[PDB]
Amino acid sequence: LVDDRMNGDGTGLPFGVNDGILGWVIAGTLGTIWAIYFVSQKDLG
Amino acid sequence: ENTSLWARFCEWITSTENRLYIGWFGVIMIPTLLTAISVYIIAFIAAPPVDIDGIREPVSGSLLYGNNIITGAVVPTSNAIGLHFYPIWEAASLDEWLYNGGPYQLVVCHFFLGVCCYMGREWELSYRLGMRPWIAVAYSAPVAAATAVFIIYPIGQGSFSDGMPLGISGTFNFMIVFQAEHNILMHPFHMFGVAGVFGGSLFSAMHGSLVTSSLIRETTENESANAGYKFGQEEETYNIVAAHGYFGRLIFQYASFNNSRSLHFFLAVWPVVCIWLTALGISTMAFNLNGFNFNQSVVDSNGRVLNTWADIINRANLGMEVMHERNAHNFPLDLA
Amino acid sequence: FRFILFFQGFHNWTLNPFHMMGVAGVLGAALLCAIHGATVENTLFEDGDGANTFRAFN
Amino acid sequence: AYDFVSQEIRAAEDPEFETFYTKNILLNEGIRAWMAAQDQPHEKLTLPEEVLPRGNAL
Amino acid sequence: LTYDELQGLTYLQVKGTGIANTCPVVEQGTSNVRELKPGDYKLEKFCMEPTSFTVKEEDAKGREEFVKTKLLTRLTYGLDGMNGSMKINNDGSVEFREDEGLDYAATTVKLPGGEYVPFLFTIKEFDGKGTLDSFSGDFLVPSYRGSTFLDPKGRGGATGYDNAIALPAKADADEIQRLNNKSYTPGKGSAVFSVAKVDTETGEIAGVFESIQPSDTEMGAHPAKDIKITGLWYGQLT
Amino acid sequence: MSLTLILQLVALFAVVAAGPLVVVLLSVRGGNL
Amino acid sequence: KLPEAYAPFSPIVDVLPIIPVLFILLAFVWQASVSFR
Amino acid sequence: MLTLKIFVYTVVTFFVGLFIFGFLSNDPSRNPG
Amino acid sequence: GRDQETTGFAWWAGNARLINLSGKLLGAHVAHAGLIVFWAGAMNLFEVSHFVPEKPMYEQGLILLPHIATLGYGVGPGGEVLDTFPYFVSGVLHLISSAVLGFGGVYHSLIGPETLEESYPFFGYVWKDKNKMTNILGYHLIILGCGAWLLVLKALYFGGVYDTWAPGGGDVRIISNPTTNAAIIFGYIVKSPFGGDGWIVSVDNLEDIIGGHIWIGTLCILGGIWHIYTTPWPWARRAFVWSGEAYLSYSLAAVSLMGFTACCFAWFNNTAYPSEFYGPTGPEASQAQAFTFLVRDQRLGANVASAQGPTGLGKYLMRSPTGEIIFGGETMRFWDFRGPWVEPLRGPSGLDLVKLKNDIQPWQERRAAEYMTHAPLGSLNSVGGVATEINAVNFVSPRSWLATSHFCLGFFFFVGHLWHAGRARAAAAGFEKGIDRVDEPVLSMRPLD
Amino acid sequence: MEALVYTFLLIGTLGIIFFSIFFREPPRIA
Amino acid sequence: MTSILQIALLGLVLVSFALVVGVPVVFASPNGWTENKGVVFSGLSVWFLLVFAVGVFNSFA
Ligand code: CLA
Ligand code: CLA
Ligand code: CLA
Ligand SMILES: CC1=C(/C=C/C(C)=C/C=C/C(C)=C/C=C/C=C(C)/C=C/C=C(C)/C=C/C2=C(C)CCCC2(C)C)C(C)(C)CCC1
Ligand SMILES: CC1=C(/C=C/C(C)=C/C=C/C(C)=C/C=C/C=C(C)/C=C/C=C(C)/C=C/C2=C(C)CCCC2(C)C)C(C)(C)CCC1
Ligand SMILES: [Cl-]
Ligand SMILES: [Cl-]
Ligand SMILES: [Fe+2]
């Protein structure tokens, strides 16, 4: 090994989320936009 | 209106007062297309050679590496990658990513997303302006063809290396190798596509000439006739009856198309349908279906093969086949 | 088709800028045909009450 | 408009410079060599199989 | 990951992780290499894994120094599956020999300023000698490109043109080196191996190696550049 | 000429004529088409 | 092939599959029968 | 490379969320008719 | 029937006159279903009549018989046809049921009530009664879930299905212990669609397939009940257009996606589409050619491990970008192929040099040669081989037919999503027939865009 | 130097497109 | 029973011909359905009887 790599290619990773930080930022961004929509529009269900 | 910032943002995004219409399809079209444009420009100008065939034989496609506009291209991804996903963060370094043809995959992906969202945006503006929403259906034909030559064919052949290079000479190379490996000229769907583009040219010239000839005299000499028409004329400035009479007398009476609506539907449907057919042909050949193969189909009484023009086409195909990738083949059958 | 492949092999007709301009002209003509047809058929005035918009024309 | 002489000269001097244009030139060469014998019978080209340009294992 | 740990894993648990390119590492051996039992052994499962590539470059002052590079060909630089012989002597003398296996790997590093340097990282027919602490030797370095390889214009040995047919008025001595001078003469490289750990019960050995071999000559077009490759090696005895 | 070919042609003619025959019968009868 | 009892009925089976494409042509015939009303 | 990956993930999630929640915010009522 | 004057739809859109005629619409849908079953039965009978069990199924251009054989029903070890009678039974049954469905469609289309709202309230939808539409969706969803559980039962307690990964050449196995783990089953849908991952197309076990169909059947029944007993949420009302053409457009988009997925499944997957019946895939054929030439040149002395190709990269074996040993040449693009005849030769780090020397069994060689000679390459007129052939072989792989046909269908049904969906939106808003010509929206907007 | 000329020509074409889009003469109704 | 099955199958084919060519005629005819309920019922009943007879004859031989 002469260098460092992600080493994720060709793996069954969900959404490519190898580390939990990616999943957390995905959830945070989606949830923030959802919160804006919910406090502006009306979602109930 | 609503004091909420989100409502203002939605109003601005869907506003029809913008010089260029952003939309909800727009918020995905703009970033993907801008990313693809940036990567394509920087790669076309200055990008190191790419090992397209995976045989450690890099191909130079950028202007900085001794290319002109005609020969320059964004070389497809390395054959070693295959259909594997190759983002920037996957590569160990930018040098490796450039070497293995990552920019091609980046541009192709962001561009496919861009064109899909462009079609959606066409529908969205049609809906916002209160018009019939079928310009996007017509635009689907170029989208179908672009998907076939950038996405579907690599998937069928198992590698992005077989996708059309983002260049001119690369395009010609793609066409020649495609003819070698699939005999596309004899495929009835490239036949329908050729009939479609030739008919598009013919009907465009015919319709434009008829409308220009039927243009009623509202402007005299000493100036261009375009001054006769006004953007708010809200009237037909051409005598449709005379044009229909001319077209009927030219070939044979009762040639139909006395409806402007029927004529324009035919103009819309001929090239669009034929391009749909040729894109489907490209995809089916991507799954190795090929055109007609009438090689040695004519034999004499004793069994000697009597050559046909299909045999000469096959000779040319053999010439292309044994040279298209000189060093990439270790076994007699391509199969890939 | 043989004629076309012969031109590619011997004359390198694809690289010739004049077939380039011809290709651009023909593809642009097809584009204009499709775009004009679709735009006219999708900006029609109502002029009728039937869902068949072809009848609403004199 | 068969060739760009600058690129041909560079490829001749540099045995590792390759573009899609050079690959197209090779394809044209293959087409000519493999179609000449039967496309132009008046030439009476009885080319042995060892002079026809050919890639590897194909 | 020792040999057993690697062997226990299935293909589906290894594909996509880059573990394949890594060579196995002895873990429960002893650093005292003099304790190995003397004899003749059939060295099999011989693997080599580089840890760095440096390219020799001579500056204005003549200071030939090795410059670090950036790899381009991903994880396709590990030699493994090699077989050979090894004679451990009582005093520690070593007669190392390599015969078969995936003993070559074509790689391409990039030099600062944007230089693509390809080379065949190989240890073919390495007939080494020396003590058990460190034994050195020479190995064959085949031509990077085979004879039948065609240059972008169709020139090449065996199958080829031997002429720049794109210039029907230029095939003269100004292009002697590029035309018909496709010299596929094999070169030689030097390597040095040091044994770090030995597991006597398993009979396996591992250590560090340093090798120097010429770069790709591009079928004799341009002079070869010296490549220095350091790394770690593993093997099993008898 | 072949018996299988003869039967194939007979079956083909029957199935082809089935549709136009019922259309014609409904037209002459006056059925609502 | 078909079981030996159904061997004589092979021509009918060889003709059957084309009926679905005959149905659309029948629809066009029916429309023509009513003057494309 | 991890920082680039997380940055791109954030950007893509932001834009896709904008798309999804913009087409939900009473879009069919945004026509002149 | 109807006319244009009373409906506004010309003959070339005549079925559009059935939008608000519930009874005749039911008749038309039942008639088309009868057509589907009739094609199934008739084509199955045609295939069995033209079938010789001596040759492989993919040699004879059969598409339905491989489908039946994958479910068991008269196949021995290695995919050998034992009884052709079950295929005949399936053909006859689908055909007779098609006759019944055709009679029903004719009745509900000609004599049955034109509108079912008055006489039969249970069947009287209104295209905007959201509760009724959800009820219909729930009924048909329950039916789909029952079908999925039917497949599960066939694989579990009714002889199992044809496992191509069984030791040897593959055989009909009774799947016990299906993969009912949530992480494994739902990891496929969130898996990437690119190479090495393949999304759900890369399903390889029969246990995974059966567990997935278990989950899908249970979820479909539960969702059918849920959509039966509930009304769409207020946010759902605003998000969607509620009309018959809108529902048609949603279904068109869904089935276009499903058609693309089926095309890729037929082209790539060899578990649910065993190569014993459908023939080799593209990757399978390429790997088979490389393997056959490797064993040929290995039998003639030589050492394929150290054999260097013209490019200096490896004539028979090389290293995948991750480091796994793989077959050399162009087939390096298909390094992620997995097949029943090549897995025994794979060690932890990919193809094993030792196993490739002596562990190769003759049946693997025979299967590899047969797959190489029957690569999925053909012409429109069914001439086997590359486009440059001698027009002597009559073969096009069934995988190629399935892939091409269902890809064309998927694309056209995507165009259907576009057309029918845009028209649904316009008709709901009111632009379906054209600009108002008295109040154009554009004339009420500020100039310069 | 040829690359410089090609880049200049492409930049000129793109600038012409930009001006024709955002600095067009307004379409005068009637 | 092979010959019996074959003649029964031919009878079923003929009855299917009659039904295919007559049921649309009876349905679309004005007042035809009401006056021909019995005929169509007899046709369908004999058609199904022939189907089941062919099935049992196939089972036997
Ligand atoms: C499988 C495709 C299909 C189906 C199921 C239908 C179904 C239907 N169409 Mg339609 N149509 C189709 C394709 C189809 N169409 C196509 C391709 C076109 C373009 C040409 C049209 C154009 C069209 C128009 C213009 C109209 C319809 C109408 C109708 C409805 C009334 C039918 C009727 O009473 O006519 C009359 C029935 C007859 C004349 C009887 C002859 C046909 C029968 C069914 C014989 C069938 C033969 C078969 C072998 C019988 C088997 C019997 C069984 C016991 C074995 C009906 C529900 C009408 C409508 O809108 O409803 C209000 C209408 O006006 N269609
Ligand atoms: C094909 C069958 C089917 C259909 C047509 C519908 C249709 C509908 N459902 Mg229903 N549902 C179904 C099956 C179905 N459902 C099943 C099997 C279940 C059991 C799990 C449910 C459980 C369910 C609930 C709990 C609810 C609905 C609701 C709804 C309504 C709102 C749809 C919506 O939310 O927009 C679109 C949906 C989304 C934008 C969210 C997407 C969520 C999925 C899981 C994303 C997964 C992505 C993943 C990566 C896969 C990507 C691959 C893909 C490209 C193929 C709608 C009419 C809502 C409703 O109205 O209540 C009655 C609601 O609350 N459904
Ligand atoms: C000309 C029209 C046409 C034709 C001839 C075909 C033909 C075919 N299609 Mg296709 N399709 C079409 C149009 C068409 N399609 C269109 C327009 C679309 C949308 C774009 C699709 C989308 C599509 C998909 C997604 C798939 C097919 C598939 C198939 C193949 C299998 C058919 C099948 O089994 O379906 C399905 C059968 C049913 C729905 C009924 C099954 C009912 C139960 C569950 C059966 C279970 C039996 C049970 C196990 C036995 C009893 C056991 C018991 C004793 C316990 C087949 C050759 C499949 C394929 O092979 O992929 C290539 C596939 O999955 N098609
Ligand atoms: C509505 C309408 C339509 C449609 C229709 C339809 C589509 C119907 C259905 C139909 C159908 C779909 C029917 C079915 C039929 C079938 C049958 C009636 C069957 C029979 C059988 C028999 C008789 C026997 C046979 C046999 C056996 C079983 C064994 C083997 C051999 C044989 C095959 C011989 C149209 C378009 C016209 C238009 C107008 C309206
Ligand atoms: C069976 C089986 C399995 C499993 C499978 C599964 C698990 C499935 C599921 C799947 C799923 C889970 C699916 C889902 C899907 C979803 C979707 C596809 C969605 C879409 C969305 C939409 C369509 C929406 C849109 C919109 C928005 C976004 C905005 C506004 C407007 C609207 C709302 C319209 C396996 C693998 C083992 C294989 C074998 C077999
Ligand atoms: Cl090429
Ligand atoms: Cl190869
Ligand atoms: Fe016009």
Ligand code: NA
């Ligand atoms: Na070649």
